[PDB]
């Protein structure tokens, strides 16, 4: 015997945004929603990967709307996607949350659309969209024709970045479109699958991101 030492109310959202969430009943955050939304409001870029059917689309829509500053004569944020049908889903997603924000205007664009008509509504002050979701082909044409002033872009949203960045021509397009936008801005992209090979390409235009991969 001797000693021997040895629920989305924790973010302070806009009253209009919160009530639209309540009226839809979507008050059950996902695991990705739990971690990213507190990070999203801070403005830090996030490279998050999540499974389909988890409400990934609504994640940035809330983030964009919360950070949205509405000015009648400029476009705030730009969302880029490859699928026309998915784009219409995004607008419908925006319409649901923009229920109590009448000043917010949102329009979409895609290939095969009369470009003059798209420029026509953009020129009109009444139909000037603060948020635009477009295919890479149509957006590039609009930018290269100087139809859209991107100096006021605040948040850069990409849906299925891996699919778009996989195609080199569209990789060129998004790179070209990114040039028309100021460097000092938030860039966020989301996809169901995000391989390791596409990460350095994504990180090339990303500074201090938050990477989440499934």
């Amino acid at each position: 015997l001797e000693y021997s030492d040895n629920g989305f109310k924790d973010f302070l959202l806009k009253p209009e945004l919160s009530r639209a969430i309540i009226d839809c009943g979507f008050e059950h955050p996902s695991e990705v929603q739990q971690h990213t939304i507190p990070q999203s409001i801070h403005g830090t870029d996030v490279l998050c990967q999540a499974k389909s059917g988890l409400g990934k689309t609504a994640v940035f829509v809330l983030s964009t709307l919360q950070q949205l500053x509405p000015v009648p004569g400029e476009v705030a944020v730009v969302v880029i996607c490859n699928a026309r049908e998915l784009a219409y889903q995004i607008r419908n997603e925006y319409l649901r949350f923009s229920k109590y924000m009448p000043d917010v205007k949102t329009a979409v664009f895609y290939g095969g659309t009369p470009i003059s008509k798209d420029a026509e509504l953009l020129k009109n002050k009444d139909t000037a969209p603060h948020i635009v979701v477009a295919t890479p082909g149509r957006l590039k044409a609009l930018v290269r024709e100087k139809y859209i002033d991107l100096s006021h872009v605040k948040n850069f949203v990409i849906d299925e970045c891996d699919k778009v960045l996989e195609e080199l021509d569209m990789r060129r397009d998004v790179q070209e479109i990114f040039r028309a936008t100021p460097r000092d801005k938030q860039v966020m992209m989301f996809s169901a699958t995000l391989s390791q090979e596409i990460r350095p390409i994504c990180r090339r235009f990303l500074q201090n991101p938050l990477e989440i991969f499934v």
Binding site: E16, R19, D23, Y100, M101, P102
Partner: peptide, 16 residues
């Protein structure tokens, strides 16, 4: 009930 596309001002939002 809302029309799912209206733009109310949150002051006259329908009480469900």
């Amino acid at each position: 009930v809302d029309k799912a596309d209206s733009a109310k001002d949150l002051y006259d939002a329908i009480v469900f």
